[PDB]
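Help! Submission page says 'invalid entity' but I think these are all valid:
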Amino acid sequence: GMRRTHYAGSLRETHVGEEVVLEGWVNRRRDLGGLIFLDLRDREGLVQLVAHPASPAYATAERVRPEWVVRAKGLVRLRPEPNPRLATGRVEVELSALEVLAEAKTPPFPVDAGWRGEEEKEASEELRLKYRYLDLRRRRMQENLRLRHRVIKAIWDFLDREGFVQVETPFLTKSTPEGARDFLVPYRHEPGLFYALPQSPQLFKQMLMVAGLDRYFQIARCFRDEDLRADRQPDFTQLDLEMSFVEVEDVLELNERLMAHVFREALGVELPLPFPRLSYEEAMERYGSDKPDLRFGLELKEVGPLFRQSGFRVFQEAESVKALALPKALSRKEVAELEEVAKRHKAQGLAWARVEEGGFSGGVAKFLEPVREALLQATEARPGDTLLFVAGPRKVAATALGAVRLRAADLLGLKREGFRFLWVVDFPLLEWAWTYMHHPFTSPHPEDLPLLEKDPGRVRALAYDLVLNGVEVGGGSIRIHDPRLQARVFRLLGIGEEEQREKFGFFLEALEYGAPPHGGIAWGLDRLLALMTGSPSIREVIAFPKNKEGKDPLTGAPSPVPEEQLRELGLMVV
Amino acid sequence: GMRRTHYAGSLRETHVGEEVVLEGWVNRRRDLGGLIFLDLRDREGLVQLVAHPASPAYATAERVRPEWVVRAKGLVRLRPEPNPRLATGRVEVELSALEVLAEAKTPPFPVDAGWRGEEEKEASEELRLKYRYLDLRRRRMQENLRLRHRVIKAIWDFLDREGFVQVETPFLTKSPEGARDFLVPYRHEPGLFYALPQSPQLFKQMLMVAGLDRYFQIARCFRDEDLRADRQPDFTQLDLEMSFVEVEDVLELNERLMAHVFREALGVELPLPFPRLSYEEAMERYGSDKPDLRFGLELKEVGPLFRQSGFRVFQEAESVKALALPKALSRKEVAELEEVAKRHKAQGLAWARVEEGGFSGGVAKFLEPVREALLQATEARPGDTLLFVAGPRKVAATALGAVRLRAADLLGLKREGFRFLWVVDFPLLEWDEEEEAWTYMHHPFTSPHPEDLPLLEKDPGRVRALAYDLVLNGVEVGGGSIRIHDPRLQARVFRLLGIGEEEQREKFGFFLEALEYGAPPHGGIAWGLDRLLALMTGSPSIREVIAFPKNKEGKDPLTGAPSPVPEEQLRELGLMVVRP
Ligand SMILES: Cn1c(=O)ccn([C@@H]2O[C@H](COS(=O)(=O)NC(=O)[C@@H](N)CC(=O)O)[C@@H](O)[C@H]2O)c1=O
Ligand SMILES: Cn1c(=O)ccn([C@@H]2O[C@H](COS(=O)(=O)NC(=O)[C@@H](N)CC(=O)O)[C@@H](O)[C@H]2O)c1=O
């Protein structure tokens, strides 16, 4: 068997009196009172080793240095005083033997403080990525990676119990000129031909429903060679799933129970069910976003129809006037910062006013007094608040004041805690010619089918987004299984026969052989884990990620190849 | 909730009298005396629907054709005569309602036979791949994929229980397992490329440097080989790594894991521990480093019997290996084995017959002078045929071992069950008989045996490696080794393999630097998961246990990959096709 008797970090008072053998890294060394203290570290935590002057390990303990790998033997003792910041804090190991297994260069940054429960100074992320195998020694990074393990295992446990079959889908597949750019892989035996890496398993998982597997899932890697700004990696991980004979309700319900199972098992957090749901229209009206942050209130209110007779022209003529009531009297500085956030979101401006005990004061207060009783019942605003207004087109006014609403939350120092999930449902199928939102296999709402040709902009889709704390962590839809309806959606989009066969030919032919009703979703697993850990970037929950620019400082990729390796592929640099 | 009350194939006599809602595919339609019988199919199997002319469901049922998708409602009743070949064969559904959810045209090959327990006729595999979403409707293919699910889940349960951390490693990484890399052009700077990983080898060793102690991953590996021998461009490994381990610790963990997998996914008990054979023992006794232990017919060294022989072809040979087959082969069969032998670099195949007192046929004359010792060494009996290959030891073993494997087929030996074994004590270097060179059997991060370190510069050919292969039924299903964790020794071994300091820095500099920060002792292994599943299902190819595999030339008939890309796209990458 193994030489070690225990993980170093697993020792407790229950082990006092046992002789242990331990292996790990020297986290720190201190000399006090003629004793040598060594913090010995492995993935379960630190344990204090003590070398006494009479001990055979005494000279060895004096020469070891941080990050050296050692094997220690000794007997577990109570400490005279416990250190409650260590789980092993009640005990130490009186060293009888100490063996050096590997020496170590001084690391470019410290990895020792977190394991003592101390705060860690921020290091250059580029330096952290270049030495990622050392960055991953830190307690924080190992907790992230081990949480990711527990989340995926919980997903397997749940979906296996519910009858889902995990199926692995191809990585070398068909390159299509459809939409986002593919990463290409040259085919050596015939220069000029390429595989593509998959943007998602969408077509394969739908074909698995056509194959009768009923329900599928995969922890899937997706590859999209597009703009890497906004915390995007060249590849990322989805929890991808698909089910047969389901309505929207069936997919949402399954995903709610799965998410609650994951949070209970991997985080010890209880998620109340069911999740709240908002239509896309309700979300835009009340929050100005299709990914609302429900950790605070401050909803937007439509007040347009209050000023239809007011002398204030810019309110009276606007298609929409949105109002927001902040529970604080803001400075002229803060208002202008909010106004700047509004104008940077295409608004014409941000009107404002303070709410006093008898009326209003400041900004547009004069034009608000005639409609005071109605304005206050609509906004539920109390004396001391500050009213913010954005007038303009309905989508612009909502989106602008919604961004004002988010930035306002920071200015007021609102406590934003916990995990607030919600479903956003009833997205529009299209948008102005006409174009779809995600992919063209999303089913129209059955009761909206006749509007497909008459009023396409009002057709709802059977599509849904999963949002957590203002972040889109999942998206999917019920699919079209009728090839006649799919052709009908293509005719509405102006997508001809030759273009369909070039982009989707093999799948459109699959629908002719009896596809069941089906639908599904994919989570952004990296985004979920970053939110679960309070990380500012998904790079903190990926073992070996790229930097923000898409390169890998650890290995040096992407790198040149010898021209003989490229000539063998029949390609050359132009 | 769902409309569906049960899976169609799950209905039993215990459900008689219940009203059920079912959804699935029409496996077959038969009309009889005005009744319409529909075998409804889903992933749990078939159940018989009955549409009566007086039912509201009848008009719908008249439209239905095979492979149409329907939702059916009605009452479970006993059949007047049961179909004992079906799990639902005692019952049927008397239809009260039926709706068509989807129509279907006639498939290019049948998918209905296996769901009835009947045998499936062989279809063209290129056609099966072109319509893989229909091929996957067959019962055997769904059994394969659901077994694959069960195996992976069992792997997760066992390794999670044993403290392994699953870590997902990169797919877009730096341009090492004995094949060519698949490249990915970097769009923003033409001439730069990523490589797809041939394995996660260096990432999992770095996770040991990071102190995670034990890792695993169900990893996809990409290797651009001449795709002979049932090669796919990418395939799947159970990859794992452990810290502070010796060879034995890795072997015992994998043994217990494999027994758990076979018990939970197949209901098969694998006796423990697995047999172990050294590389030398395996080659001497079986002429192969992946022995097939499902039959006997071991090889015997008889060189020391011919040192006084007039037969120069025997007398000069380093080795003469013999094998006794329990049958009097025909001259046609002997020439076949001789051809097998010659295809494996042998100078030829000798033969004879064992009769009640003397010998007959082939080289029997030269076998007669040495009879007592030969019969004791081979245990041959009257009616047997003796075969010999004379030559260098490795040649003689390998040629007659391939004859041994072929002969098992000619004799029709019943080879059954699952015979695992470890092959251990591999040499660090393998001699290429062709290119007359030393090459490494396992990748360059394999640790030499610590007792053999002074032989690295004195005599590299006798250096043992701390490497091991896992063999199942004559197939290599796993391979691994204890790694080098000392940076000086890793550079020393790179120097031995003909890799100068310039080459070390360019390909492995980041990893050599990592060894300088306190790398623990570590080792690991990787299973060929597709290979394992193919053996577990008796499949002739790993294509039968992969949902959407390539064909033998690495092409995807279903999607048309690989394919040209627009001239505009290729321009954006800054590359062009070289003109012949
Ligand atoms: C980092 N990163 C990205 O760069 C892009 C996406 N995602 C997350 O993937 C989810 C699904 O992706 S999708 O493109 O919307 N739809 C799809 O991929 C569809 N195939 C899903 C379906 O219809 O079932 C999003 O909701 C995000 O949470 C990221 O995490
Ligand atoms: C289809 N296919 C192939 O094309 C190639 C390999 N394999 C299977 O992968 C195992 C490990 O692969 S290895 O390259 O030997 N070692 C490695 O990849 C080492 N990195 C593992 C280690 O040292 O821990 C083999 O034992 C086969 O069972 C296939 O199934």
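Support: the input was valid. A stray whitespace character was the problem, and the output above is from the cleaned input. The first strand of chain B starts at residue 19 and ends at 32.
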